[PDB]
Amino acid sequence: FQGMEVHVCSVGTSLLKNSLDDDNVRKEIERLGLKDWDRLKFDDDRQNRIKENFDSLRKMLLKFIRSKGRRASAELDSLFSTFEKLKHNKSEIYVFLYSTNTSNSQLAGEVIRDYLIEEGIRSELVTVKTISSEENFYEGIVDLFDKVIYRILKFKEQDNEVYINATPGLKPESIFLTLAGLLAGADLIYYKYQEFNDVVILPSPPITIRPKYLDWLIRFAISGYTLSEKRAEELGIPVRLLEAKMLVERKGEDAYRLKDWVRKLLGIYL
Amino acid sequence: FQGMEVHVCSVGTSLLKNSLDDDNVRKEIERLGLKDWDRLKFDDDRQNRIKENFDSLRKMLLKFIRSKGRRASAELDSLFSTFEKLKHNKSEIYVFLYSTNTSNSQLAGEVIRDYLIEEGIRSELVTVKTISSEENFYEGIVDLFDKVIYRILKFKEQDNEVYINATPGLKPESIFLTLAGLLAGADLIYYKYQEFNDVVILPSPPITIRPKYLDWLIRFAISGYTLSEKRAEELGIPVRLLEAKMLVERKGEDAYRLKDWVRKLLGIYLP
Ligand SMILES: [Mg+2]
Ligand SMILES: [Mg+2]
């Protein structure tokens, strides 16, 4: 599509936590022993309870939102407040949500997506990999490029505006989303402060990779993603500088390998 | 100075919250009705109770850290874990802390600074404006430029490495610190996940303002910070484009004003 106002938003579990204010919901949640379903980790066996009762829980959460309104969740509150601030009309909006492949997050995500659609706002939910260690953190970043950042690219190529809602989600993820999102051409970043109940447009300077580094990185790609130290020397690529910035890693002992996430980043410019 | 490993870190109040585990601290804080001192808002009259008892509370908190270790606060836990990961030695480190000009935050900041110093790590604490509304948000950003980002510029000009600790602090501020910090030449951004007790280096690509925007912004600046529509046209500046990205604002009958924070940003690229 073209000419749309696209909002990109991570999915947290404030909806799950907030819903416990409703006695009906709480009762059912207690019957299932899911009192802290908003905090369940990816490997908690109680995720399977959510999964086995997904349809029932979804419909129940939809009832909760319908009655509660935007304050039902941090996603909804920040989204609707920002539509009003920037004067985005329902018929113009596309809400792009992403959650981890975990039952509790996926439930929040499907409910939020389905409610937006009920309200006349086009919405899509994508699923990304769980980050649970330093090693799989970078695998998660790679997946965010594939599932989210590259979609931002495509939205911009199709002549849409893109607004990043930084309100929900874990800090390190929102920092990445803001950074890579801006490099991919996102227009503005925004954040709703609950403290003073107001939406702020965060400074959104249009940015790009420094030209010298982009040049060096492209040489790396063009030549091969893993390069001997000599080959890299012939190309004028300052490997030790790139290593210090954690863009490449020594693979003993001739070789330097461009990190997977940096390859994805290059995709923005190729 | 030169050749140091400089860590830039915002100051939160996890220290205050964690210290309630110390019976001596907890009973004294209860005496002052400060059980919620970690969440005290900027305009709470009780901030003055912290101020009036600042030196006493500072020593009590120092005793707590001395006994508790790095887990006393998110700052200390993330800093010390990262020194170990990156192999930074105490003699090489400079910890640049910044807190708001509020009693509770400044208390946490001075205690953390003083503790680091006791352990042989050079440290400095600077104070920034409180953000409490959308209007004063941008005044806060401007102050972060003057107090923090411009110091990163100077650390880099004096041949030091700069590492941004994104662990503590409110999300929006950490996002700004990361962006402007990288633009100013910071080397790496890092974050300790408490959940799995490990420090990750966040992706830290070397970045700059897009060239055509930087050109437009510089043309704007050298001509004047508030420009008529007519003059902006003659300079070839697409003011509506800049307005849409919230870099300039329409003022008066026919003028466009470069936002204060954008003027500070340009300071990175001009002298
Ligand atoms: Mg407002
Ligand atoms: Mg590790």
XYZ file of C-alpha atoms and ligand atoms in Angstrom:
543
model
C 0.000 0.000 0.000
C 0.871 3.706 -0.246
C 0.173 6.954 1.596
C -0.474 5.274 4.966
C 0.648 6.307 8.466
C 2.426 3.182 9.698
C 3.039 2.757 13.438
C 5.588 0.123 14.494
C 5.088 -1.154 18.025
C 6.602 -3.879 20.217
C 4.132 -5.968 22.223
C 4.551 -6.204 25.992
C 2.278 -7.825 28.550
C 0.773 -4.828 30.342
C -2.579 -5.990 28.917
C -2.305 -9.272 30.822
C -1.377 -7.530 34.074
C -4.009 -4.795 33.726
C -6.777 -7.328 33.012
C -6.509 -8.751 36.529
C -8.412 -5.655 37.678
C -11.468 -7.376 36.262
C -12.801 -9.919 38.770
C -14.138 -12.231 36.059
C -10.743 -12.351 34.375
C -8.891 -12.754 37.665
C -11.173 -15.608 38.721
C -10.506 -17.536 35.507
C -6.790 -16.765 35.691
C -6.728 -18.117 39.242
C -8.641 -21.218 38.181
C -5.815 -21.835 35.729
C -3.042 -20.882 38.146
C -1.792 -18.054 35.916
C -1.648 -15.203 38.468
C 1.568 -13.772 37.017
C 0.999 -14.662 33.384
C 2.314 -11.195 32.522
C 5.776 -12.233 33.776
C 6.099 -15.816 32.523
C 9.482 -16.546 30.947
C 9.842 -18.310 27.600
C 10.694 -21.651 29.229
C 8.028 -21.632 31.954
C 5.775 -24.682 31.587
C 2.808 -22.482 32.528
C 3.091 -20.982 29.033
C 1.494 -24.215 27.818
C -1.590 -23.454 29.895
C -2.011 -20.181 28.024
C -1.473 -22.075 24.770
C -4.061 -24.774 25.489
C -6.643 -22.142 26.443
C -5.620 -19.532 23.868
C -9.003 -19.010 22.173
C -10.899 -18.672 25.453
C -8.324 -16.270 26.906
C -8.246 -14.154 23.751
C -12.031 -13.629 23.704
C -11.933 -12.806 27.408
C -9.204 -10.197 26.953
C -11.136 -8.674 24.054
C -14.116 -8.225 26.361
C -11.815 -6.582 28.903
C -10.421 -4.078 26.388
C -13.841 -3.284 24.888
C -15.016 -2.228 28.333
C -11.802 -0.565 29.520
C -10.659 1.426 26.494
C -7.174 2.627 25.559
C -5.940 2.448 29.157
C -6.269 -1.349 28.864
C -2.624 -1.538 27.791
C 0.523 0.536 27.279
C 0.360 -0.245 23.551
C -3.214 0.957 23.117
C -2.786 4.000 25.341
C 0.363 5.184 23.529
C -1.073 4.394 20.079
C -4.417 6.181 20.447
C -2.849 9.154 22.226
C -0.409 9.544 19.354
C -3.029 9.215 16.608
C -4.803 12.166 18.239
C -1.601 14.195 18.678
C -0.373 13.744 15.097
C -3.915 13.806 13.719
C -3.806 10.358 12.139
C -7.220 9.170 10.995
C -8.263 5.529 11.430
C -8.640 5.022 7.673
C -5.005 6.165 7.247
C -3.347 4.044 9.911
C -1.539 0.701 9.738
C -0.365 -0.746 13.053
C 2.564 -3.101 12.708
C 2.989 -5.114 15.894
C 5.695 -7.620 16.742
C 5.909 -10.031 19.639
C 8.118 -12.927 20.671
C 7.050 -16.464 19.904
C 5.846 -17.027 23.469
C 2.282 -17.776 24.534
C 1.805 -14.804 26.850
C 3.260 -12.233 24.442
C 1.506 -13.744 21.425
C -1.812 -13.607 23.282
C -1.347 -9.891 24.072
C -0.336 -9.298 20.461
C -3.265 -11.119 18.885
C -5.742 -9.433 21.213
C -4.331 -5.967 20.535
C -4.275 -6.584 16.794
C -7.840 -7.923 16.768
C -9.166 -5.016 18.829
C -7.539 -2.415 16.583
C -9.163 -4.127 13.597
C -12.563 -4.076 15.346
C -12.091 -0.308 15.763
C -11.465 0.134 12.036
C -7.669 0.271 12.208
C -5.707 -2.073 9.912
C -3.204 -4.092 11.892
C -0.677 -6.896 11.451
C 1.222 -9.010 13.982
C 4.588 -10.596 13.326
C 6.560 -12.992 15.521
C 10.247 -12.660 16.422
C 12.817 -14.842 18.214
C 13.140 -14.840 21.998
C 16.278 -13.278 23.482
C 17.397 -15.221 26.559
C 21.225 -15.130 26.577
C 24.109 -12.996 25.293
C 24.782 -15.521 22.540
C 21.206 -15.604 21.304
C 20.833 -11.825 21.715
C 22.517 -11.286 18.351
C 20.378 -13.994 16.760
C 17.417 -11.985 18.048
C 18.784 -8.792 16.514
C 19.242 -10.608 13.185
C 15.594 -11.704 13.343
C 14.450 -8.167 14.162
C 16.205 -7.034 10.977
C 14.425 -9.742 8.963
C 10.959 -9.359 10.527
C 10.799 -5.684 11.448
C 13.554 -3.462 10.088
C 13.293 -4.760 6.526
C 9.507 -4.148 6.702
C 10.195 -0.535 7.664
C 12.372 -0.373 4.536
C 9.584 -1.695 2.349
C 6.980 0.624 3.897
C 9.233 3.598 3.040
C 9.868 2.325 -0.490
C 6.093 2.172 -1.040
C 5.685 5.839 -0.083
C 4.315 5.481 3.445
C 5.269 7.376 6.591
C 6.646 5.290 9.471
C 6.393 6.167 13.167
C 8.184 4.097 15.785
C 6.319 3.703 19.083
C 9.141 3.228 21.615
C 6.764 3.016 24.594
C 6.371 -0.743 25.144
C 9.157 -3.315 25.221
C 12.493 -3.896 26.898
C 14.970 -1.015 26.776
C 17.759 -2.677 24.766
C 15.249 -3.699 22.105
C 13.703 -0.226 21.839
C 17.173 1.287 21.516
C 17.973 -1.081 18.664
C 14.571 -0.482 17.051
C 15.082 3.282 17.195
C 18.598 3.115 15.784
C 18.053 0.580 12.985
C 14.585 2.003 12.368
C 15.977 5.484 11.727
C 18.729 4.086 9.480
C 16.000 2.288 7.498
C 14.156 5.594 7.035
C 11.586 5.714 9.834
C 10.226 9.254 10.128
C 9.725 9.850 13.837
C 10.200 8.079 17.154
C 7.684 8.598 19.926
C 7.188 7.731 23.574
C 4.318 8.186 25.994
C 5.382 9.188 29.482
C 2.808 7.713 31.857
C 4.036 9.979 34.683
C 2.716 13.156 33.074
C 0.257 11.414 30.730
C 1.677 12.889 27.534
C 3.248 11.765 24.278
C 6.623 13.137 23.314
C 8.254 12.993 19.882
C 11.818 11.912 20.667
C 14.603 13.658 18.737
C 14.590 11.854 15.377
C 17.625 13.091 13.418
C 17.802 11.505 9.957
C 20.911 9.343 10.110
C 23.107 7.031 8.065
C 26.239 4.921 8.554
C 29.397 7.029 8.329
C 30.498 6.910 4.680
C 34.012 5.620 5.401
C 32.622 2.706 7.418
C 29.874 2.000 4.916
C 32.550 1.885 2.213
C 34.725 -0.545 4.226
C 31.713 -2.727 5.084
C 30.564 -2.925 1.475
C 34.072 -3.992 0.411
C 33.874 -6.752 2.992
C 30.536 -7.903 1.565
C 31.556 -7.642 -2.087
C 34.726 -9.655 -1.485
C 33.314 -12.314 0.836
C 31.850 -12.194 4.337
C 34.917 -13.891 5.808
C 38.269 -12.533 4.625
C 41.910 -13.410 5.290
C 43.992 -10.683 6.963
C 46.051 -10.263 3.800
C 43.053 -10.064 1.450
C 41.635 -7.395 3.763
C 44.952 -5.549 3.591
C 44.859 -5.481 -0.200
C 41.404 -3.890 0.023
C 42.477 -1.135 2.423
C 39.954 -2.262 5.056
C 41.119 -1.360 8.603
C 40.091 -4.641 10.271
C 41.374 -3.767 13.753
C 39.195 -0.667 13.842
C 36.127 -2.679 12.839
C 36.940 -5.353 15.428
C 37.142 -2.780 18.224
C 33.655 -1.622 17.262
C 32.474 -5.243 17.312
C 31.478 -5.156 13.640
C 33.788 -8.042 12.670
C 35.417 -10.910 14.569
C 38.732 -12.646 14.088
C 38.308 -16.204 12.890
C 41.772 -17.664 13.461
C 44.042 -16.655 12.210
C 44.111 -15.246 8.730
C 40.471 -14.366 8.780
C 38.057 -11.624 9.764
C 34.319 -12.355 9.556
C 31.604 -9.717 9.256
C 29.017 -10.268 11.993
C 25.591 -11.562 10.917
C 23.725 -8.505 12.231
C 26.095 -6.207 10.339
C 25.351 -8.133 7.133
C 21.647 -7.460 7.735
C 22.436 -3.785 8.337
C 24.204 -3.643 4.984
C 20.948 -4.837 3.427
C 19.564 -1.354 4.074
C 22.069 0.111 1.615
C 22.290 -2.627 -1.019
C 43.352 13.367 30.156
C 44.091 10.819 27.408
C 44.069 7.065 26.838
C 41.341 6.277 29.374
C 38.282 4.012 29.155
C 35.437 6.389 29.852
C 32.066 4.979 30.936
C 29.024 7.280 30.649
C 26.171 6.289 32.914
C 22.829 7.820 33.928
C 21.956 7.667 37.636
C 18.718 5.981 38.662
C 17.485 5.224 42.168
C 17.867 1.446 42.391
C 20.451 2.091 45.116
C 17.796 3.681 47.314
C 15.315 0.905 46.682
C 17.842 -1.873 47.316
C 19.125 -0.222 50.500
C 15.833 -0.902 52.299
C 17.233 -4.405 52.750
C 19.618 -2.771 55.221
C 17.858 -2.633 58.596
C 19.730 0.468 59.693
C 18.848 2.282 56.482
C 15.215 1.105 56.538
C 14.494 2.179 60.121
C 16.064 5.606 59.584
C 14.175 6.118 56.332
C 10.979 5.039 58.104
C 11.805 7.618 60.782
C 11.807 10.261 58.047
C 8.766 8.816 56.281
C 10.861 8.207 53.158
C 9.959 4.562 52.502
C 9.300 5.480 48.874
C 12.387 7.658 48.368
C 13.346 5.757 45.210
C 10.177 7.032 43.532
C 10.074 10.559 44.936
C 8.884 12.976 42.251
C 10.803 16.189 41.509
C 8.211 18.397 43.218
C 7.590 16.277 46.313
C 8.138 18.397 49.412
C 9.825 15.391 51.015
C 12.832 15.816 48.698
C 13.770 18.472 51.227
C 14.011 15.847 53.972
C 16.669 14.165 51.858
C 18.408 17.511 51.334
C 18.362 18.434 55.030
C 19.887 15.073 55.921
C 22.076 14.631 52.842
C 25.467 13.979 54.444
C 24.093 11.493 56.973
C 22.143 9.537 54.371
C 25.136 9.524 52.066
C 27.334 7.838 54.698
C 24.639 5.298 55.525
C 24.282 4.392 51.850
C 28.069 4.107 51.531
C 28.107 1.656 54.414
C 25.396 -0.349 52.627
C 27.357 -0.575 49.364
C 30.596 -1.408 51.167
C 28.867 -4.441 52.674
C 26.601 -5.430 49.770
C 29.025 -5.167 46.855
C 28.279 -4.485 43.179
C 24.674 -5.681 43.488
C 23.849 -2.612 45.599
C 22.683 -0.804 42.465
C 22.004 -1.260 38.749
C 24.778 1.220 38.017
C 27.402 -0.614 40.085
C 26.343 -4.088 38.943
C 26.399 -3.102 35.246
C 29.640 -1.082 35.534
C 31.700 -3.701 37.383
C 30.413 -6.563 35.235
C 31.419 -4.625 32.129
C 34.874 -3.718 33.403
C 35.457 -7.467 33.725
C 33.980 -8.329 30.315
C 35.936 -5.689 28.409
C 39.066 -6.049 30.556
C 39.168 -2.476 31.780
C 41.521 -2.021 34.725
C 40.669 0.339 37.598
C 43.675 2.589 36.822
C 42.340 2.997 33.227
C 38.712 3.816 33.986
C 36.835 7.115 34.260
C 33.157 6.879 35.228
C 31.132 9.876 34.067
C 27.810 9.892 35.907
C 24.874 12.225 35.414
C 21.802 12.702 37.570
C 18.866 15.088 37.658
C 18.958 18.069 39.984
C 16.678 16.338 42.494
C 17.665 15.342 46.035
C 17.026 11.593 45.687
C 18.797 11.215 42.347
C 21.697 13.429 43.368
C 22.093 11.430 46.587
C 22.341 8.176 44.631
C 24.787 9.867 42.245
C 27.160 11.222 44.880
C 27.153 7.938 46.778
C 27.960 5.934 43.656
C 30.666 8.386 42.608
C 32.224 8.369 46.084
C 32.161 4.581 46.252
C 33.862 4.166 42.890
C 36.535 6.606 44.077
C 37.074 4.621 47.302
C 37.674 1.527 45.141
C 40.302 3.363 43.086
C 38.193 4.321 40.071
C 38.167 7.982 38.942
C 34.617 9.332 38.749
C 32.710 12.546 38.160
C 29.057 13.451 38.699
C 27.292 16.147 36.689
C 23.745 17.439 37.144
C 21.074 17.884 34.477
C 17.599 19.462 34.298
C 14.556 17.428 35.315
C 12.125 16.365 32.595
C 8.529 16.648 33.867
C 6.395 17.707 30.895
C 6.427 17.545 27.108
C 7.360 21.222 26.949
C 10.311 20.905 29.314
C 11.330 17.592 27.767
C 13.170 19.472 25.007
C 14.825 21.817 27.520
C 16.074 18.620 29.157
C 17.468 17.307 25.864
C 19.242 20.632 25.324
C 20.805 20.302 28.785
C 21.865 16.700 28.049
C 23.679 18.061 25.004
C 25.514 20.717 27.051
C 26.279 18.532 30.075
C 26.773 15.068 28.613
C 26.977 14.832 24.823
C 29.466 17.696 24.490
C 31.626 15.981 27.131
C 31.624 12.849 24.994
C 32.880 15.042 22.141
C 35.685 16.314 24.335
C 36.619 12.857 25.682
C 36.921 11.668 22.083
C 38.954 14.712 21.016
C 41.434 13.940 23.810
C 41.979 10.375 22.545
C 39.901 8.395 25.043
C 37.475 5.571 24.360
C 33.872 6.137 25.426
C 31.432 3.408 26.441
C 27.772 4.221 27.034
C 26.095 2.260 29.831
C 22.431 2.133 28.776
C 21.373 0.014 31.764
C 20.051 2.653 34.191
C 17.647 5.479 33.422
C 14.275 5.980 31.780
C 13.922 4.484 28.306
C 13.446 7.753 26.357
C 16.608 9.238 27.855
C 18.646 6.105 27.157
C 17.422 6.151 23.567
C 18.525 9.775 23.201
C 21.856 9.109 24.945
C 22.571 6.223 22.553
C 21.703 8.180 19.400
C 23.393 11.471 20.225
C 26.223 9.586 21.963
C 27.011 7.593 18.810
C 26.706 10.718 16.663
C 29.239 12.332 19.019
C 31.658 9.440 18.512
C 31.002 7.107 21.455
C 32.584 3.731 20.697
C 30.159 1.146 22.106
C 26.805 0.981 23.863
C 26.209 -1.682 26.469
C 23.418 -3.083 28.605
C 23.270 -5.621 31.432
C 20.279 -7.926 31.315
C 19.480 -8.717 34.946
C 17.258 -11.601 33.840
C 20.157 -13.745 32.659
C 22.868 -11.846 34.530
C 24.961 -10.970 31.496
C 26.226 -7.849 29.747
C 25.601 -7.462 26.045
C 27.224 -4.965 23.715
C 24.311 -3.440 21.818
C 24.766 -2.950 18.063
C 26.847 0.239 17.799
C 27.167 1.201 14.131
C 29.197 4.377 13.509
C 26.655 6.958 12.368
C 26.266 10.532 11.187
C 23.451 12.831 10.086
C 22.379 12.117 6.497
C 24.491 14.390 4.246
C 21.657 16.238 2.543
C 19.974 17.020 5.876
C 23.293 18.078 7.413
C 23.885 20.414 4.466
C 20.402 21.915 4.845
C 20.805 22.324 8.620
C 24.225 23.957 8.267
C 22.953 26.354 5.605
C 20.152 27.208 7.994
C 22.543 27.820 10.884
C 25.134 29.956 9.099
C 22.319 32.132 7.768
C 20.468 32.553 11.048
C 18.481 30.364 13.407
C 15.183 32.002 12.475
C 14.746 32.488 8.711
C 11.949 33.932 6.584
C 10.223 31.618 4.109
C 11.698 33.737 1.320
C 15.279 33.398 2.490
C 14.887 29.690 3.184
C 13.745 29.251 -0.418
C 16.774 31.117 -1.764
C 19.108 28.887 0.234
C 17.378 25.853 -1.268
C 16.213 24.665 2.148
C 13.108 22.418 2.104
C 11.601 23.878 5.265
C 8.420 21.801 5.046
C 10.492 18.633 4.999
C 12.433 19.787 8.067
C 9.160 20.764 9.763
C 7.706 17.291 9.167
C 10.720 15.773 10.957
C 10.246 18.255 13.795
C 13.659 19.848 13.248
C 12.204 23.329 12.639
C 9.029 25.147 13.697
C 6.934 27.752 11.922
C 7.039 31.017 13.858
C 5.598 34.492 13.404
C 3.793 35.227 10.146
C 6.232 33.689 7.684
C 9.346 32.408 9.467
C 10.912 29.082 10.429
C 12.956 28.565 13.576
C 15.560 25.833 14.044
C 14.763 23.954 17.271
C 17.153 24.524 20.198
C 18.103 20.839 20.423
C 18.914 20.746 16.718
C 21.215 23.753 17.189
C 23.016 21.726 19.881
C 23.188 18.701 17.557
C 24.887 20.816 14.887
C 27.516 21.713 17.483
C 28.802 18.168 16.955
C 29.691 19.098 13.371
C 30.592 22.783 13.791
C 32.834 24.715 16.180
Mg 1.108 17.413 24.982
Mg 28.609 -13.342 28.682
